[PDB]
Amino acid sequence: ADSLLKYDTPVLVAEEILNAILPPREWVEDTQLWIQQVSSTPSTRMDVVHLQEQLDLKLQQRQARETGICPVRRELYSQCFDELIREVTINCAERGLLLLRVRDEIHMTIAAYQTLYESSVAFGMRKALQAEQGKSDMERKITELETEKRDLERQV
């Protein structure tokens, strides 16, 4: 398994802050675990330039759809943001705390917006389908009243 931005040197079997901002990712195969670190690498402004290049390289390479939503694009930007939080935190823990805190809060905010849309359309078709059941009850009403009109014909 893989992660395309500066997860460090898988081990097969500040540092507190460097974990806290971003758990060192894991995957396990045949009970043998690769733990891939967030190193204390004090990355550089030039590394920032290189990240910029490599990110736009990825973006065009997949051709992530740009305007409006795009899961691929959003995830790429999440990788960028994760590297930025790493860089700040290794520069200063506190600045990284505030950055990660805001990253989390906005991530929950977008999650809420999605949840809202999902449920709002859920209401929309749930009305549509409740009304369609109501129309099925119309079908019942007309059919049974037609049988009652047969009953009225029998009654005449």
């Binding site: 949840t115 809202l116 999902e118 449920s119 709002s120 859920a122 209401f123 749930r126 009305k127």
Partner: protein
Amino acid sequence: TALVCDNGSGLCKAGFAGDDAPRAVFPSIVGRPRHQGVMVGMGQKDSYVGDEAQSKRGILTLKYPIEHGIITNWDDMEKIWHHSFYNELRVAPEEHPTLLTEAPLNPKANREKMTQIMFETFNVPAMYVAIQAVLSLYASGRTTGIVLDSGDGVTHNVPIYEGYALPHAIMRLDLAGRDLTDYLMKILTERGYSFVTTAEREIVRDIKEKLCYVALDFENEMATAASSSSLEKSYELPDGQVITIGNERFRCPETLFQPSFIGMESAGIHETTYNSIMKCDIDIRKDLYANNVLSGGTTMYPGIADRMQKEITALAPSTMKIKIIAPPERKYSVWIGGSILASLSTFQQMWISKQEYDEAGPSIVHRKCF
């Protein structure tokens, strides 16, 4: 997490449970665009609801939902709830148990219908019903109380004992904020300000909030007002005309004690409350005298607490400590009560819930609920 929505007929309030204040307030009105073909062309939403409806009040149709405290149309009320949840509360309604409130003695079918519409259409897993006075007493923080409640479309008195309402002693009186606005409009017309349009009528409502107050000794107050300009209080209309009001400021409140000014014959609110406690039992009469609590918009008027204290004491036997209480937030206090009530964890155990909702379903709002 839980939601609380409330309708003193006049304005409706929407809030997250346990909060010391509701998160939005908006007025009890719905409006549909008058050309449906234009609306479907636009995709502009089904109805304007809440204050923006007022902003558009002339450009579209407007209608009220809960007149005299009772549901006039279900479909409008559900549109209110929809607007409340999405625009004010934003939350998914499916994800948050929700509290809705009703005037007392609501005809039985309305409770069932209301339940059915909430559960089935809005899709929350659990919901509870409360009678407004019951929540307002919860805000006061007694199980044991006689409540005065007046939201601008209705007024009631309600005895409640250890947390239940003794039904027979409940009375209705059809004399509320709207009626007061109309009487005030009439008497100002006699002065010659002649408010009639909806916009002007809203201005009248604002005057009621700004400058009314009860008299104590009404006939003395009236005489002193006639004696001198010193009682005058002036106001300037939005158009910049200045208007001046004397006796009328307290006179308008008098109608509550003095319904003959309205030409209706049931005795004034103080009398009605006395007669209600007389319908209640001497066993509990003392505590009812002990806890007189005022609820809803009309209680907004300054000083009414003292006037009630005097007039009740006079109508009462002079053998108890009468105690009026007018909890400062008394109009919101109805919603505040619900907020704290739903906050109570055990009420989660009270929840009516989907699994019951299939079999036990519409009837349990009668059978399980209070």
